Amino acid sequence: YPPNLWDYEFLQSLGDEEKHLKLADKLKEEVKSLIKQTMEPLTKLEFIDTVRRLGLKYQFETEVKEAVVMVSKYENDAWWIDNLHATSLRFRIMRENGIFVPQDVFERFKDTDGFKNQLCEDVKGLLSLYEASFLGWEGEDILDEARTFATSKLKSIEGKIPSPSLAKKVSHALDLPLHWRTIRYEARWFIDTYEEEEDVNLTLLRYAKLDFNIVQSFHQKEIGRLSRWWVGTGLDKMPFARNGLIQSYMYAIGMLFEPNLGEVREMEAKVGALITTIDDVYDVYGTMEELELFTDITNRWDISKADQLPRNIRMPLLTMFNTSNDIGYWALKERGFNGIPCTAKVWSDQLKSYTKEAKWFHKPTLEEYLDNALVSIGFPNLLVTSYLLTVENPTKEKLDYVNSLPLFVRASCILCRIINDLGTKSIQCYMGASQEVAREHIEGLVRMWWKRLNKCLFEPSPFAEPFLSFTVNVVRGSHFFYQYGDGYGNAESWTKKQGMSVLIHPIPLN
Amino acid sequence: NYPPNLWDYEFLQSLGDEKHLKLADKLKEEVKSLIKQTMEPLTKLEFIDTVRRLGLKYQFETEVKEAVVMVSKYENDAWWIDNLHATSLRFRIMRENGIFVPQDVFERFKDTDGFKNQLCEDVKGLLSLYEASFLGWEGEDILDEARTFATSKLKSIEGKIPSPSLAKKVSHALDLPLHWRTIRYEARWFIDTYEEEEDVNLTLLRYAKLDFNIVQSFHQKEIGRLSRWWVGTGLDKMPFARNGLIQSYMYAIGMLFEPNLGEVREMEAKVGALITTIDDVYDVYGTMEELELFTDITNRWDISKADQLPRNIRMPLLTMFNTSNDIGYWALKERGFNGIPCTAKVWSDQLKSYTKEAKWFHEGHKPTLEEYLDNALVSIGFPNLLVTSYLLTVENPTKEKLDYVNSLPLFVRASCILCRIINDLGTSPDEDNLKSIQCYMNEAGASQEVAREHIEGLVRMWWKRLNKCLFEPSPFAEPFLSFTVNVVRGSHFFYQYAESWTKKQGMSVLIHPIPLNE
Ligand SMILES: CC(C)=CCC/C(C)=C/CC/C(C)=C/COP(=O)(O)OP(=O)(O)O
Ligand SMILES: CC(C)=CCC/C(C)=C/CC/C(C)=C/COP(=O)(O)OP(=O)(O)O
Ligand SMILES: [Mg+2]
Ligand SMILES: [Mg+2]
Ligand SMILES: [Mg+2]
Ligand SMILES: [Mg+2]
Ligand SMILES: [Mg+2]
Ligand SMILES: [Mg+2]
Prior knowledge:
The structure is a homodimer.
Chain A: H1 8-12, H2 18-36, H3 41-53, H4 61-73, H5 84-96, E1 110-111, E2 114-115, H6 123-133, H7 141-157, H8 164-175, H9 183-195, H10 202-233, H11 245-255, H12 262-285, H13 288-300, H14 311-335, H15 340-359, H16 366-376, H17 379-390, H18 396-402, H19 407-422, H20 426-430, H21 435-458, H22 467-482, H23 489-504
Antiparallel strand pairs in A: 1-2
The complex binds farnesyl diphosphate (FPP) (2 copies) and magnesium ion (6 copies).
One farnesyl diphosphate is lined by residues 248, 251-252, 255, 268-269, 272, 275-276, 279, 283, 379-381, 385, 423, 487 of chain B.
PDB class: oxidoreductase
Keywords: substrate binding, synthase, inhibitor, oxidoreductase
Assembly: dimeric
C-alpha cells in the first residue's frame, strides 16, 4: 500500500552505497577542474549558474567566486554588449556575488520609450532579463520596467517554444523567479530539466545526482530522529493541529539543506513544529483563561502552575519549555554560551504577539498589524535562534541586537508574514479599497521588501554566513510552500509530491 | 575521549545499526511443552530452576508458577524427605514463588550439636543448602546455622573439587549466592556452565542462547540511543565521571533487562549517569560555595542563577534539570500524570544528603553508623532511582502514591540501606570517617575486621526483611517489587569485595553475541 509521508510510523523508519561515496569524491574533483578550466566568459557564467541550480554551489564556493571574479575582470566587453541573454546573466551572477552592476547595462536594449518590442522572440534573452530583474534595488526603475516587459512577452510565447528545456524553464520562472525559489527543491527539479538541455555536461549531471542522493541520506536520518522526538512528545496525537513536524522539517530544508548544518536544522525544525502547534492553541483551541496562564508561565519560565492547564494545552507548554531548555543548553555545550535566557525570551515575545492578535479578536493599520504580525509569524523566534546557534562568539549584546530586528532581519520577517497572508489579516487590514487592489498592493510590498533585502547584502553588516543565507532562504521557503498550505486537494498532493521527490525517493543513477 | 572510556561511543552506536526469530518462537513453544510435561517432582524443580538461571523465567512466568504450584500439591513427600538437595531446592523454589515452607524441614539434617558432619560427603547437597539459606527470614535460626555450616564445609573444598561443573558452581556460589546475583549477568555465565553439565537439555540450551542474542540486540540499540544522548549533553568531556554512562547502563541491565521495559530502562540509565556525574561534582570538583548554589537552584527548580556556576558544574546541573523535566513529561504524555514535581523532589532530597555529608567532612563530624546510614541511604541515590522507577511503571500514579514510596516503607528502606552498605563494603583499604565500616569503628571502638563483620551482618539482616516483605508485598506490585530487589543484586555484583572485570562483563553481556551452532 502507498508509503504515507504523513505517517509518523513510516517517518520514524527512515535512516535505516559506500561504493558510490568514492565516485562522488572523484566526480567532485572532475567538476572542480571544469569550474577552474578556461572557457569563453559567457560559457563560464552559464556553467557556474548551472552548478548553482543543481544545488552544488555549497560544494564549490571558492571555485565559483574565483570564477565570477575572473569574469568581472575580463576587460573586453564585446562578449555581452548588445546580447540580451549575456547582459542579463552577467548582471544577475555579478549582483548574486556582491559585485555591483548598474541597471544601465540594459540601455542598449531600450530607449527613451522603453525596451524594444523587437525582443518578443528572443525567449532565452527574455527569460534571463526576467530572472535578473529580481536582483534590483529600490529606485532602480529600468529593472522594474524589465520585469513587467519580460513577464508579458514570456506569457505570450508560452507554448510556442521548440526547445524542451527552455519551454520548461519559462513556465517554471513565471510561477516563481529563480531568486525566490529554495536551493534544495529547485535542485531536484533542475536535475530533470538540465538532463534535457543541448549543452548538458554528463560529469556535472552524474555528480548532481550522486551528491543529491548522499545529501538525501543525511536528511532521512534527520527525519527519523525528529519523528521519534515528535511521537515522544505526544503532540502527534493532539487534535487542533495538522502534520506539524514533517511540514516544519520540509520548510527547514528550504531555510538550510547542507549536511554540515544538520544539528541546527533539526532544532529549527523542532521550533517550527512547536510554533505551528502553539499558534493553533492560541488561534483556535485555547480559551482566554488558558492563554494567560500559558503566556504567564512562559514570561516567568516557571512551570509550577503547569498542572492548572488541561492535558492538551499543558503538553504543548511543557514541550516548548523542555525544547527551549534543550536548544539553550546546546548553545552552552557547543558554542560556549547558555542560550536559555535567549530561547525563553523569543518565546515570551512570540506569545505576546499572539496575545495582541487575540485581544484584537479593533482594526489596526496595515502598519500596526505588520508591526505585530512580523513577530507572530515566528521568524524572529526562528532567526534569532538560528543566529544563537551559529554566530562566532555569541554574547548577550549580539543577541539583544538581532532580537531588536534591524532592517535586514525585519525585512525577512515582514516578507514571511506577507507571503503567508497572500496564501489564504494583511489584505483585510489594508482594504477603503477592494480585495483585488489590496492583494495587488501587498504583492507590491513583497517586491519592495526584496529590493531592501537585496541591497542589505551589499551594505555593511555585523552579520555573516550562514545567518545571511538563513535570512534570505526563509523567505524563499515561504514563497515555495505558502502557495499550497490549504491541507487538502491540489495543495496537499503537490506538497506530498515535493516531500516524496526531495526527502524519500533517491534519483535513479547509472 | 581522553581519558579513554571502556568503549568509544562511535563503536557503541556501531552495535545496534529472520531465520532465528522464527526458530525462537518454535523453540519457545518446545520449552513451554517441557515445562508443562510430566516429570518426577525433583526433576521438574531442577528444570524450572535451570530455566530461571538461564535468564528465561520472564518468557515462561505462567508455566513456571503452575509447575511450582503442581509440585507444592504432589501428595507423597518421599521424593524430598531425607534428601538434603531435594529438601533445599524445594524450600528455595517454593519461597521464591511465595509458597511458605518452614525452616523446620531442615531439622532432620541436624543432631543435638547441629548439622550432621556426614553431609560433607555430598557437595551438591551442601551447595543446595547454602543457596536455600538465603531465602530465610529473621528469627529463622536453623537457616542461619545452615548458612554457617554449608559456607564452612564448601570453603573446606573450594578450588580443590575434581568435578568441573560443581567446582565452578561452588566457587561462583561462595563469591555470591544465586539469590544475591543479577538475572541477566547470571544468565550469561550459566549458559556456559549449563552447556558443560551432565543433564544438559540441548533444546533448552539452544533457546537460552537464541533468546539471549535477541534481548542483547534490544540492549545494543538502547546503548546507541543513550550514547548519542550522552555525547549530546557534552558530559562525556567533563574532566570527571569517566565511564559514567556505560557503568550506569550496565547497572540498569541488573535492575531490569526485559525488552518490554526498554523505555524505563533508558530513563533509569540516564538518572544513574547523572547521579555518578553529580556525586563527582560534590566529592571531587565543586567548592562548598559552588555546591550551595547547585543545591539551592535544585531545591527551587529555578535555573536563573545557573550562569554563576563554572561550565563544568553548570553543564551537569542543567542536564539534571533538562532530563528530570523530560522524565516527568514522559509520565504526563504516557501515564497521564506530570512527574516533574516528583523528579525535582528526589533530586532536591539527594543533593541535600550530599550537602550534609560535605558539611560533616568539613566540620570533622564523626556520625554514628545510625546517623550516617539515615542520610547515606539517600545519598547512594536509590530513593531517586526507585521512586523514579515507580513513577514510570505504577498504574494510575498520583501525588499520594509517590509521597508513599518516597516515605521509605520498610521494603524500600531495606533496599536503599542495602545498596549503600554494599557500596561501602566494596571499598579497598583506602586512605574515611564518612563510610559504614569507619562510622561503626568510631562508634563501638571496634577494629576494621570486627566492624566489617558487623556490617556484613547488617546486609544479611536487611535481606531477611526484604525476603519477608515479598510474602506480604502490600501496596507494591510488579514490576516495582522486582526493581527493589534487583537494585540490591546489581550492587552485590558491581561491588564485589576492577576495570578489566567490568570490561569482561560488558563484552559478554552487551557487545558480543553468543556463538550459535545453527
Ligand atoms: C524554517 C522553519 C522550520 C519553519 C517552520 C514552518 C512554519 C509553518 C512556521 C510557522 C508559520 C505558520 C504557523 C504557518 C502556517 O500557520 P498560520 O498561517 O495559521 O499562522 P498564523 O496564524 O500566524 O497566520
Ligand atoms: C540502577 C542504576 C541505573 C544505577 C546507576 C549506578 C549508580 C550511579 C548508582 C548509585 C551509586 C553511586 C553514585 C555510585 C558511584 O560511586 P560512589 O561510590 O562515589 O558513590 P558515593 O560517593 O555515594 O559513595
Ligand atoms: Mg495565528
Ligand atoms: Mg494560524
Ligand atoms: Mg496564517
Ligand atoms: Mg562519591
Ligand atoms: Mg559521594
Ligand atoms: Mg562510594
